[model samples]
Target: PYTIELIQPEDGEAVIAMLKTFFFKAEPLNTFLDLGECKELEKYSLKPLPDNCSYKAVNKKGEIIGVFLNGLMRRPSPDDVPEKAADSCEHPKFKKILSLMDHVEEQFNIFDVYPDEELILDGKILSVDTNYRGLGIAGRLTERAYEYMRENGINVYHVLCSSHYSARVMEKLGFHEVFRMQFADYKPQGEVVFKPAAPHVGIQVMAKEV
Candidate 1:
């Protein structure tokens, strides 16, 4: 049986390598384009995970075989002004992660904009190595996340500029197309980051039962 263990700081570089491999395989341009350069990884030095988020996976014989990593954002109830607090109390390490992310966002001047007070829980990133694709790891990871969100009373889970492959996966997992945006000649190094920056698939968004 396969079990996913939460990834810790020590295991981050390995995760980056694995994730980079997956990106290039699925979207070749990533090899040269450097997609999803969120900068948070560098800022945090991969020590602590981002707020309300985690990177977990199934490891076999000391090899990482599958993974699911996502970022969680907490916004005050739509009706609540001053939006309660822009804080993630989900994990003790989140505060630091969030702070570091803020610095990265500013340093890079990341430009994609969404509402500021919606408590957006962006599905930052996720992956299941090709070697492990047939084993239901994707479904398992998504289900685990869904349950957690449902229990927490979140009704809207948004995925920003996600890839078409991810959109399909989310659809299969019961996520609906809230809408979609398109781009051309995208720069994987730019704020609106893309992996495998090719003429093929670019930035996209798809979501499901939040």
Candidate 2:
């Protein structure tokens, strides 16, 4: 078992270190994006926000075993999206990833979900230590997120899970799959994009109404 704590801004570097150790190369999306070699893009996760709504699971020895990083995003309207949304990214790899996210984000409109101007918790990333697998730490971190949602008046939480394991985790926590985009279908210019390893066929966007 592990204890959960709110992640603070000062914990950014530690969290990034943990991400580098577990997320950059190991995460399915990062692997597909070939982001392990893009050190600058990796640091984008460390950007401070007004509300750093994140959590970490610590072992009895006080070592962090898991991390659930989250951020808030306003539901976009036709007038709200910036003209140069994808152009804001400097790294080509990062830009591609961000652009993919933008495409995924558009599904919200296509599905007619989430009211305009509402703030939704974006479950950005979740990582667990290799030794800590199957210990229920992920569930605990998710539960903490729901608690924060209730206390903070946040009504919606969503995640774009590239990891099949993570998709199952979210489903177990009462999140329903809202949309799915197969990796094979995400080709551009007659070329298949994101050739990740087996068992990871695509990304699924899951959400829970809190």
lDDT score, candidate 2, position 63: 74
Model 1 compared with the native: what TM-score?
A: 0.60
Q: By lDDT, who's the top model here?
A: 2
lDDT of 1 by residue, 168-199 (tens): 77777777766443334333245533334544
Q: Candidate 1: give the clashing pairs.
A: 29-196, 30-196, 75-119, 175-208
The window of 10 residues in a row where model 1 has the poorest summed lDDT is: 103-112
- The residue-level lDDT of candidate 2 at 97 comes to 72
Error of 1 at 186 (Å): 7.6
What's the distance in Å from true for residue 149, model 2? 0.8
Tell me how many clashing residue pairs each candidate has: 4, 0
Q: Estimate each model's TM-score.
A: 0.60, 0.87
Q: Taking the tens digit of each residue's C-alpha lDDT, what string does model 2 give over 57-150?
A: 8889977788988887665666865344356778877777777667666544422576542677888788999889888887888889889888
- Clash number for model 2? 0
Candidate 2: which stretches are off by over 4 Å? Answer: 48-50, 82-85
